[PDB]
Curated annotation (Swiss-Prot), chain B:
Domain Protein kinase: start-end pairs: 9-270
Reactions catalysed according to its record: L-seryl-[protein] + ATP = O-phospho-L-seryl-[protein] + ADP + H(+); L-threonyl-[protein] + ATP = O-phospho-L-threonyl-[protein] + ADP + H(+); L-seryl-[tau protein] + ATP = O-phospho-L-seryl-[tau protein] + ADP + H(+); L-threonyl-[tau protein] + ATP = O-phospho-L-threonyl-[tau protein] + ADP + H(+)
Family according to the record: Belongs to the protein kinase superfamily. CK1 Ser/Thr protein kinase family. Casein kinase I subfamily.
GO CC annotations, alphabetized: centrosome; ciliary basal body; cytoplasm; Golgi apparatus; nucleus; perinuclear region of cytoplasm; plasma membrane; spindle
Record gene name: Csnk1d
Protein name, entry field: Casein kinase I isoform delta
GO terms (BP aspect): cellular response to nerve growth factor stimulus; circadian regulation of gene expression; endocytosis; Golgi organization; microtubule nucleation; midbrain dopaminergic neuron differentiation; non-motile cilium assembly; positive regulation of canonical Wnt signaling pathway
Reported function: Essential serine/threonine-protein kinase that regulates diverse cellular growth and survival processes including Wnt signaling, DNA repair and circadian rhythms. It can phosphorylate a large number of proteins. Casein kinases are operationally defined by their preferential utilization of acidic proteins such as caseins as substrates. Phosphorylates connexin-43/GJA1, MAP1A, SNAPIN, MAPT/TAU, TOP2A, DCK, HIF1A, EIF6, p53/TP53, DVL2, DVL3, ESR1, AIB1/NCOA3, DNMT1, PKD2, YAP1, PER1 and PER2. Central component of the circadian clock.
Activity regulation (record text): Drug-mediated inhibition leads to a delay of the oscillations with the magnitude of this effect dependent upon the timing of drug administration. Inhibited by phosphorylation. Exhibits substrate-dependent heparin activation.
Comment block on domains: The autoinhibitory domain is involved in regulating enzyme activity through autophosphorylation and possibly, through heparin binding.
Length: 292, 286
């Protein structure tokens, strides 16, 4: 027979994995809406879907945060059903032959910084910023970048008093080592500045096609990353990328970042380049011949 | 036969001396990891090891704090094993022909001020700040500065009430004379200002390569230090260093220092010089 979850979500193929398990395509038979269903087996080894779910319900309403459809349990499974979106920035990056133009980078950089800014205003730090965790919406919102996966998310300050967490060494799950900030490698507790630093690496990745410490291991990546000076990394690209990264490496653990300044750098460069703020990305141009 | 401690570690060469014990190289015979073993003879009329080991344990988790691996009792010694770190800030200074560039000094300055801040946050004052008591980590943590030796450490305020220890004089220069604050040379009870002042001398020492009162005993040192103006001392280097010392010497006994401010100074100068944030120090460019 047809496999269904709960009472109305028809389960489909496995579209991918995440931190808290795998994401499957699903169909709200009750209204014909293809959704994304995240499943977690009852093995209380480290049950987390309940947590990430709360954070999603907390970040609800903000621009670029997916809407959770339903939550529950089906046999040996915890189920979080959520709004299905479009391609991720990694899918789009490969779709464009792993080449983004300066325009697309800046267009993306503008929205990514704001998504991060929003998450922080809600007292949390994402802790795992990478191309895979940013998805383009569909339809009317095809021009909106979404931030997903609050699996490694952590609260960085008391929600009421806003008392920042203490400067201590890290005792928690790590994210990708490729986009990790230096502090993460040094074993220090992450804060707002770390989410931003990683973004710096995501942008250079979009520009470069591959980071210099890619394809080598953690101890090595740490070394290579610490050994590759910024100016050498951002070589041949607008100084705004190196300025962006330096600014980030400069923040103090509990400093509040100047998000306006970071968006400003790229915007001024945008205008100076003569680009227009239409949302015509490389992938939109590819149908005519070149996503470059 | 092979000399072993607690049947867990084998004793190696005497790699130095702590504030109240000797330090020996050691090997966790099991894990094959080298460690640093500190010994204290059972017959002392002033046993500090049981106290010091406790300070470390309560500082556990802080960035730059070494971890205690084991505490044992042999026949004639009390044993405390902690992880061996890398070379001290003196080993490297000396290795770098006694000359540290301004950015290595500013990069280290930021970390060194964080360690002392954390210590004060745990209700203690170190009281023996010097380049010897600062070691670089190992491996990927080799860019991180650690603070060690709590032999002279003291609680400066009650844990709960946070009431500061009373003002008292007639005290004794407890620590190294070369980096001791002036108030210390005046036999005045030490407080948070003192750790920072001494750090001031450690930074200048890094700049100058030596100090006025260095190479003359104690009273002579006091004489120089007192008769040497901060302007003269820091003459030829970014005024931030003078600003730092002036601020420290201006603090009051029970004053809660503004660590942030003092860090801002060096962060402003690091920025103005146009230095970038890489983790490459002088010693790496040799």
């Amino acid at each position: 027979m047809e496999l269904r979850v709960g009472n109305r979500y028809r389960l489909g193929r496995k579209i991918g994995s995440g931190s808290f398990g795998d994401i499957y395509l699903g169909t709200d038979i009750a209204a014909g809406e293809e959704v994304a269903i995240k499943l977690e087996c009852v093995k209380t080894k480290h049950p987390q879907l309940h947590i990430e779910s709360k954070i999603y319900k907390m970040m609800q309403g903000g621009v670029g945060i997916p809407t959770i459809r339903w939550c529950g349990a089906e046999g040996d499974y915890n189920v979080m059903v959520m709004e299905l979106l479009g391609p991720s920035l990694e899918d789009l990056f490969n779709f464009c032959s792993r080449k983004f133009s300066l325009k697309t980078v800046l267009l993306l950089a503008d929205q990514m910084i704001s998504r991060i800014e929003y998450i922080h205003s809600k007292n949390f730090i994402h802790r795992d910023v990478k191309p895979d965790n940013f998805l383009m919406g569909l339809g009317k919102k095809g021009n909106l970048v979404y931030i997903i996966d609050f699996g490694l998310a952590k609260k960085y300050r008391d929600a009421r008093t806003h008392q920042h967490i203490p400067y201590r060494e890290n005792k928690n799950l790590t994210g990708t080592a490729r986009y990790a900030s230096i502090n993460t490698h040094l074993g220090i507790e992450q804060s707002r500045r770390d989410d931003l630093e990683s973004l710096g690496y995501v942008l250079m990745y979009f520009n470069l096609g591959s980071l210099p410490w890619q394809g080598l291991k953690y101890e090595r990546i740490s070394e290579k990353k610490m050994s590759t000076p910024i100016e050498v990394l951002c070589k041949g690209y607008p100084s705004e990328f190196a300025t962006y990264l330096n600014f980030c490496r400069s923040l103090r653990f509990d400093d509040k970042p100047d998000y306006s300044y970071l968006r400003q750098l790229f915007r001024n460069l945008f205008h100076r380049q003569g680009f227009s703020y239409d949302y015509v990305f490389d992938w939109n141009m590819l149908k005519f011949g070149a996503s470059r």
